[model samples]
Target chain A: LKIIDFRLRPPAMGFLNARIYTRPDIRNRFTRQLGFEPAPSAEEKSLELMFEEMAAAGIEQGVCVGRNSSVLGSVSNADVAAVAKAYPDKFHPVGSIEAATRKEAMAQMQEILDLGIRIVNLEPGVWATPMHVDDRRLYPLYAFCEDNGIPVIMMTGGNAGPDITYTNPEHIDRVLGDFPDLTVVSSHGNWPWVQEIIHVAFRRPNLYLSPDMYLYNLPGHADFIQAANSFLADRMLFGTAYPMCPLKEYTEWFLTLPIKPDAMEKILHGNAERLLAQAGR
Target chain B: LKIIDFRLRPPAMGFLNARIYTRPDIRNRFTRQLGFEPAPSAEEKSLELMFEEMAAAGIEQGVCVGRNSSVLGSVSNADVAAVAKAYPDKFHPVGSIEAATRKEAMAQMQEILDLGIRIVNLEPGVWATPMHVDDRRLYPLYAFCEDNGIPVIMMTGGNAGPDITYTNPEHIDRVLGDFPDLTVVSSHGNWPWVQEIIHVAFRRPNLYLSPDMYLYNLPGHADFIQAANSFLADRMLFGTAYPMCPLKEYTEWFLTLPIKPDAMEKILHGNAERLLAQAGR
Candidate 1:
C-alpha cells in the first residue's frame, strides 16, 4: 500500500528555516508535559530519518509545498523545485504565492506558472500582510491558478492569523462559488467547523478536503471519513501535512480509518496521480 | 442576572474549620493587620442564611465543595450533602477525597455516589502525606471518577501545598495528559504562576480554571483575564472563594474585571452551568 502523501516540507525547506513543525510546540512546554517520548531528539528530525519512517508506512511520494509568511518565513517555489529535482521520484514541488500588492502577487504566480509547478498554496492567514481568503486582493491569484489548471491548496482552518476566523469556512465557501472551475484544496479541512465544512464540501465541486492532522485529532473527523468513502473519495487525498507528527504515525492512523478499499486507493494514490498526470505540463 | 459560583465552601461545610484564615491565633493578623478579614463562616448562620446572602450577590446557586485536607482537617461529604439537601435549590454538593492510598481513595469515591454529590474534589497538597497533584498514587481515583463520568475539581495554586511545586501546572498538565477524557478543574486558578497555568490551559482542553479570589487585583490576573477574554473563554469559570472573601463583594469586584461581554457571560454562568449539568443528578 504505497501512498502518495499530498503534503510535506522536506529538508531543503527545513534547511532554509532551520526548523520544523514540532519546534515551537515541542521545545519548551509541549515536549516536557507532552513528551510521551523523550522530546524528538535533535538528530531524529532530519529528512533522511523521516524518509525511512515514511517508507515504513509505505509513503511512496510526498508533495513538498512551500510557504511565504512574514512570521513563518518562506520555503520558496525555487526551494521546492530544487528539492523535487534533487529527489525527482520521491518529491513533487508545489509553489506558494504571497506579496504586498496584487500586481506583485500576479508576478509571483507568473513565475510559479513558468516553473511548471502543478500546485500552489495560499495561507492568506499567515501572509506578511494577512487577508481573509475572500478578500478581493486574492482574486487575481485565484483567477490565475484556475485558468492555468493548477490545484490551489489553501491552509484554511483554526491556525495562524490574529483570530480563528482567518480560516473560516464561510470565506472559503465564497471562493468556491466565485472560482467554480478552479480546483480548491481546502487543506486543514476547515476544522472545528467540520460539519459546516462538510456541507460546503457537498455544495462545491471545487473543494477537495484534506485535513491531515485535524482529521485525525479534531471533532467531525468521522464525518470526513464518511464524506470521503461516499462521494468525495475522488478528490480526497491522504495528506499528512507531515512533520506535524511522525510520518508513520499519521499514515498508520489513516489506514486504520473505516474508509473502503477502493476509496482508500483513490485517496492514497489514484486521485492524486489523476490530478498530477494532467497538471503542470 | 443570577450567577453560579463555580467554587466555594460555605458555612454548612464548616468551611472556616477547614480553612486557615479564622484560626483564632492568626485571625486578627488578617482582619486587623491586612484588612483581608476573617473567614465569614463564623458570622453566617445557616444554609438558608447564606442562601439569602448569595441572593444579595445575585448568585442564584453555588457549588458547595467538601475538603479532606489531612492536617488542615476535613469538611465531610455528608456536610456538603446536608447543605445541598437543606437548600436544594441553592447548592450543588461536591465531595472530596485525599486518602492514604489508592485503595482508600477508591473507597472514598463510592461514597460520592451514596452522598448524591454531583462532582468530586481532590487537594493532594492538603493530604496528611501530600503528594504532587499528578502523583501516580492518585491515578486510580482520577480513573474511577472519569470512568463514572464524574468531573474532578482540584485545589491548585499556592494554597494547594506545603510548597509551590505541589500545585505546579506541570503536575496538572501531566494529569490531564494521562486522563485526556477527564474534565478537571484547577479550583484556585494556579496563581503566582498564572502565566504557566494559562499555557497549561492553552495546551489542555480538559482543564477548567476557577480562579475565585485570584481573579481580582492579583499581579497577573490581567493576563488570566486576557486569556479568558480570548482563547480560554469557554473553560474559565467565575468563583468567589466564598467566606474567604465575602460573596457579595467578591461577585461585585469580579463583575468589574475588564473582560469582554460575551466572554463574561460564558465565564460567569454558561461555562460553569454546562459542566454542572454534566455532573448533575
Candidate 2:
C-alpha cells in the first residue's frame, strides 16, 4: 500500500549536522541516550538514500520540516522549500519559527506562510527563547494559522519540554478550547501522559497524535494502538521522525502492527493526504 | 437545610494568620487578588462567629484543613483536629503535607490518617519543595491515598499555583488516569479552563470541582451552573472558601444561585456526604 509519512527531517535538511545532534563529545545524543545506534552523519547520508528508503517502504509522500531552534542550528523555511521544490511530488515542506511576542511571531508567520509552506513547526524546548504551546504570546500565531486554514505541528514530549511539565497535554487542551479550528499535530505523542493524552484526543477533534517515536518504542505504545483502532483513527498520523530512524526499517516495522487494515490505510496514508489538503498544501 | 461546604478553613483553623493572609502588606493575598474585601483576622473572628455564620447560611458541615505550607506559615493537623474534636457533628478535619521523598510523604500520610483524617490537602504551589500534582514523586502518594480509600484535595487555580500554569486541570486529569479510583477534589475549580474541567468531570468519575469563589463570581460561572444542573451535578461541590469571602455574605450569595433545587441538594449536601462515605469518613 502507498504510504504518506506525516513528519520527517530528511538528511538533506542538515538537522543531523546541527550541534545538538552531532557535537564532537555528545555524538548524536538522541541515538546515544535513546539506546539506539547512531545513524550515519549528514555528510554520509544523502537525499538519494532517503528517497530510496521511502520507495523501498512504498511511501509515496512525506512532509519534510524546517527546524528553527537557534539552540540547535537549524534548516530555514527557504532551505526546506527549495528541497520540496526539487522533489515536488514527494516532499511537502513544513516551516518553523521560535515564538516571540504576539505581533512579532505572527509577523514571522506571515513570511513563513508566504513561502508556500503549509504547516508551521513549534519547538519550545529548543527555541532561542522558549514559551509553552499555550503561552499567550503564541496565541496570535495559532490564531493566524487558524484564520489562514493552515495546520501546525508542535514538538511535544520530554525532549521538547524544558520544564518537562511544559509537555503536559493540558496546554494543548487549552489551545484547542481557544482555537478549535486549528489542527495541532502533536509530535512525540505526549508520552508519559499517554492515557491522559488519549483522554484529550477523545475530547478534541482538532488534536492529532503523531507520537512517531514513542508510538513505536515506549511501554505505553498499546494505548495509541488501541486509540487509533477506535475513535482516534482519523486523527492519527504516521511519522517516521526520519534521520533518527531509517525510513525503510521504521516504516516496515510500523506496517507489521496488528491494526485493522481499514484504520491502517487511514493512519499511514489517507489521514495525512487529508491533513495536507486541510492545510491547503 | 444542611449545607456541606466541601472546602472551609473556619476561623479557628488559622489560615488567616498564615502570613500570606495577615502580613504587613500582603494581608489576605487571597482577598486582594480575588477582588473581595478581607474579613477580620483569627483574633477578631471567633469560633462562635464561624458557627453563627454557618448556621445563618445553613451550612451543616465543613472540612477544616491542616495547612502545612511552610512558605505561608500554616496551622498544624493537631490544631485542625482539635477544632473538629470540639464540634464533632459540624467539622471534618482534612490533612496536608509538603511532599518529600515518596515514602516520606506516604509515612506522613499514615500519621495524618491516624488522626482520623479522610482527605489530604496538597498545595504544590506553596509547598516547601513544590512539585506539580502529577510529578512522579506524587504518583506514589496518590496511589497510597487510593489504596487506603482516602480522597485528596489539590490546590488548583492561579492563586495557589506559584506559576499559574500549575493550576491547569490537566494535572488532575493525569492523576485520575493513573489512579482511577483516587477521588481528586479540585480546589479553585481550575478556572479560566472552566469549560475544559467540566469536559474532564464528565469523563472521570473520580474528579470533582469545589469551585467555591469562582462558582459565584467568575465570568463563566453559568457554564458551571449548567453543568451542576446536568451531568456534573453529583461531582460539583459547594464551598465558601471562608475568610477570603465573608462567611455569611458569600454563602448566601452562592445559595441564591439559580441552580435547580434538586441539583443544589446534591451539590450542597448529598454529594459531599456520598464522597465522605466513599472515603470511609
Candidate 3:
C-alpha cells in the first residue's frame, strides 16, 4: 500500500492561482472530476494536516513539484526545503530554477541541487520566455541535470494559454534526441498526443512518461496503461499533479485500473525509486 | 423523463473512426467517459435496434447532427433522412451542407431546407473551405436559414482535424453578431472559453449554448450547469454529441445534475422544442 506521488502541490498554495482554487466554477469542476470536494478553506490546512492526510492514505512519499512563476506567486525552493526538512520521510521536495543565460542557469541549478533538492521541475509552458522543452533556454538546465545527476520533470502537452506551443509533445522529441543521457519525466501524458509520446518513449531509453492531470481520462490512456504493463513498464510512473486532483481520490481511482499488480507497484513506487536511484549515475 | 438529444450520431457508424473506436485503449477510454460500453460490434445494430434502445430509454426525439465532411467519409443528409423517415417520432434529422462558394451554399441550403429539414448543421472546421462560422462563405447560408426560418446548429469548438482555426469561439462571436436574427446553436459551449461563449450568448438572444462534447467533466462545466438553471436557462440546450457519448447514458447523467427540476426539464426537451418552434418565425 506504500505510494510515492511524483507530483503534488502544497494545499496552502492552492489559492495562488485564481483558476484552480479561487474560482467557484473551476473549483466545482475539479470537485466532480476529482470525485471529491477540495477543502474550500484549504488555506487553513497547515503542513501537518497535509502530512496527516498523506499518512492515512498510505502515501509514504510525495514529490512537491515546486511551483515557481512570475505570473503566479509560486512555491520557492526554500519553501519546499522547509517541508522536506521538517518531514524528510514524507515529503521529498523538487526544486525549481529559472535564469536568463546558460551561465546563470548553471549557477542556479548547481545551487539548488547542492541544497539537496533531488529533482528539478519546470513548467515549460508557463516560463517567462515560454520556450519549448528543446529551446536553448532549457538546454543549460537539461545539461546541468544530466551532468549533476538530477531527473527533470517537465510540463508537456497542451496548455491553457492561447498559442503556447512550448508544452507540445513534438518538442519533447528534440529534447530526447539532444540529451540521450538526461532522465526526463514528461508529465501530462503529452495528451492529445498519447501515441506520439509512446513512440517517443519507445525510441528513447532515457525518456520516462507520467500523465498527471491527464491520467486515466486522457485519450489513449488505456494504451499507456497496457504499454506500461508491457515494454515500457519500468519507464512509466504514477503522479497525481495535485491541487488539480486530490491525492487520496486519485490514488483510489488509479488502483482500480486494470494494470498488472507488479506493474502497478512499479508505477506506484518502483519506477520513481529506480529513476531517482539511477540519477546519481 | 422525456429527453430530446440535440446531437447524436448513427450508432452503426460508431466504428468509422478506428482511433476513437476500434482501438481497445481508445474504446475503453470512451466507455469510461460515456459511462457505458459501446456495442462490441456496432455493425450488428439495425435501425430497428437503434430505435428500440431509444424507445426503451424514453428518448422521444434525437437530433442527428449529420457528420458530413469533405475530407472524411461522412454521414449524408440522405442517411439521416432515412432514419427520420423510418421513425419520424423518435428521429429528427439535422441536415448538413457543404459548398465551394456562397452561391453553391445558398442553392444547397435552400434545397435542403425546402425538403423539410428543420435544422441546418455545419461542421465549420470540417467544411470544404475550412472557414470560420462568420466567413462571408457562411453568411449567405446563414441568411438563407434566417430567411427560410431554419435554425442552424454549427460546430463551435474543438475540431478533430489539424490546424482548423474555424472552431474558435471568437469566430462564433462574429457569426452571432452578423446574424442577429438567426437561431444559432453553438455546440461544445466554446470550451476552454466557456465564459466567452456565455458572454456571447448573453449579448445575443438568438445565440444558444450547448455543451455537446463538453459535458459535466469539462472545466467550468459546473458554471455552465448553474447558468443553464438561472438567467440563461431558456437559452441552454442539452446534447450528447454522440457517438462520443451514448444517448441513454448522457440523458441519465444529465438528469442527475444539480439543475432545478424545471430547468432540467427544459434542457432535456423544452429548450430544444422552443428553438425548433421559433425556427418557423
Chain A vs native chain A, TM-score per candidate: 0.91, 0.90, 0.88
Runs with alpha carbons beyond 4 Å of true place in candidate 2? A13-17, A20-29, A32-35, A39-43, A69-72, B1-281
Q: How well is each residue in B1-281 modelled by candidate 2, as lDDT tens digits?
A: 67888777866655556664456255454455445566553336566866776777788898886688877878877777788898999988888887667888888788888887778899877888877788899888887788878888888753565444576677878888889988888887876467678888888888888888765544347778999889888888888777657666777778788889999889889888988897684
**What are the per-model numbers of colliding residue pairs?**
0, 1, 0
Best by lDDT: 2
Q: A129 in model 2: Cα distance from truth in Å?
A: 1.7
Query: What pairs collide in candidate 1?
Result: none
lDDT for each residue of candidate 1 in B1-281, tens digit (9 for 90 to 100)? 75889876666545556643345454344333323554454354355666667878899888878675534466677777877887788778888886986777867777778877768888888777788888888888888777877898988874688987776556787788688889998887887666456656766778898888766666466668767766688999888766556677778878887889999999989998899888873
Error of 1 at B107 (Å): 49
Summarize candidate 2's per-residue lDDT along A101-194 as a digit string, tens digits.
6666666677777888878888876676766788877777788789878788888775776777778766777787689888889887877667
The per-prediction CA RMSD against the true structure, in angstroms, equals 18.1, 15.5, 10.8
Question: Mind giving the per-residue lDDT tens digits that candidate 3 earns over A127-231?
Answer: 565556777777867876777667888877545222324444568899889889888888776654566678999898988888875654434556688788887
lDDT of 1 by residue, A11-117 (tens): 55543472454354543332233222221322355666667777887989998878877677667777778888888999988888788789988888878777767
Ranking by TM-score: 3, 1, 2
Q: Which window of ten consecutive residues has the lowest lDDT sum in model 2 chain B?
A: B24-33
Task: Report lDDT (Cα) of residue B97, candidate 1.
Answer: 88
**Where is model 3 chain A poorest over a 10-residue stretch in terms of lDDT?**
A158-167
